[PDB]
Design an enzyme around this catalytic site. Structure first.
Site, mmCIF file in Angstrom:
data_model
loop_
_atom_site.group_PDB
_atom_site.id
_atom_site.type_symbol
_atom_site.label_atom_id
_atom_site.label_comp_id
_atom_site.label_asym_id
_atom_site.label_seq_id
_atom_site.Cartn_x
_atom_site.Cartn_y
_atom_site.Cartn_z
ATOM 1 C CD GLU A 145 -12.663 -2.394 -8.069
ATOM 2 O OE1 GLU A 145 -13.356 -2.750 -7.128
ATOM 3 O OE2 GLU A 145 -13.151 -3.057 -9.382
ATOM 4 C CG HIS A 203 -5.352 -4.094 -3.646
ATOM 5 N ND1 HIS A 203 -4.327 -4.154 -4.452
ATOM 6 C CD2 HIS A 203 -6.548 -3.619 -4.520
ATOM 7 C CE1 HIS A 203 -4.824 -3.666 -5.755
ATOM 8 N NE2 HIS A 203 -6.035 -3.466 -5.833
ATOM 9 C CB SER A 257 -0.952 -0.069 1.233
ATOM 10 O OG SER A 257 -1.734 1.059 1.300
#
Length: 271
Positions: free
Chosen positions: A217, A249, A119
């Site tokens: 997305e 994720h 991330s």
């Protein structure tokens, strides 16, 4: 498991930084945390069996603790609003202060290591390798922000940072026109990664872990594709690009990738 918790003074931040540590080799995997990094434990240890997975791998494991929304970077100033009473200097800590301490006290090599982030810190890992190639011949980005200075990303990063502890992106890298945004953009720094022959491991998931999920997305998909294409176009020859359809994720899949890359890191760092 011989896991330790250490207090490592940061001269630049005027405080002690907690570091979770497991030895086992002169070279180390630096496991960087996500956006909501806590001050008690690193997210890798909270959510995954990373220490056990790398036990007796011939590699040490370093998990710095803290730095919510910091992007593991050196900030311009203390964050405006949430009352931060010092300036984040996490690039200085990771590249100077912490390796000096680990070398002097434990014999951990300041050079020849891997930076692994997810991330928020996926990009951080690539940037650390871009500017400190001797320290990090290996970098992995798992669901990182690969083009933070472009298009929607400065706004989305600003929003994410504010949602995670109320941190201010302007205090970090300035307005999006500031040179710090491009300086810290992995896409923009691909030529450094190529010149350095950095071994890079780049993972992107699909799906959803305001703004509609499908729009976000789409942005993520396009930017990931652009990074892979640009790396090849710029002469890159030392990368692994993993975009499995069912990847997410999430900590379970970030762990799957950490396990998958272990043999890769062992061969690159230890022959």
């Amino acid at each position: 498991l011989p896991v330790e918790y250490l207090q490592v003074p940061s001269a630049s931040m005027g405080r002690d930084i907690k570091v979770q540590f497991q030895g086992g080799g002169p070279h180390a995997v630096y496991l960087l945390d996500g956006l909501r990094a806590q001050d008690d434990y690193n997210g890798w240890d909270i959510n995954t069996p990373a220490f056990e997975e790398y036990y007796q791998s011939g590699l040490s494991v370093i998990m710095p603790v803290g730095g919510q929304s910091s992007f593991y970077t050196d900030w311009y100033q203390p964050s405006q609003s949430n009352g931060q009473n010092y300036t984040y200097k996490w690039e200085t800590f990771l590249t100077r202060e912490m390796p000096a301490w680990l070398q002097a006290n434990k014999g951990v090599s300041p050079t020849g290591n891997a930076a692994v982030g997810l991330s928020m810190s996926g990009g951080s890992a690539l940037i650390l390798a871009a500017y400190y190639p001797q320290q990090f011949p290996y970098a992995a980005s798992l669901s990182g922000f690969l083009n933070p200075s472009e298009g929607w990303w400065p706004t989305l990063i600003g929003l994410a940072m504010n949602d995670s502890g109320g941190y201010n992106a302007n205090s970090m890298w300035g307005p999006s026109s500031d040179p710090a945004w491009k300086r810290n953009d992995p896409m923009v720094q691909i030529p450094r990664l190529v010149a350095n022959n950095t071994r890079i491991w780049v993972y992107g998931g699909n799906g959803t872990p305001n703004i509609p999920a499908k729009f976000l997305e789409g942005l993520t998909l396009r930017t990931n594709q652009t990074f892979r294409d640009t790396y090849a176009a710029d002469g890159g020859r030392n990368g692994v690009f993993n975009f499995p359809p069912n990847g997410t994720h999430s900590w379970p899949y970030w762990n799957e990738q950490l396990v998958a890359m272990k043999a890769d890191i062992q061969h690159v760092l230890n022959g």
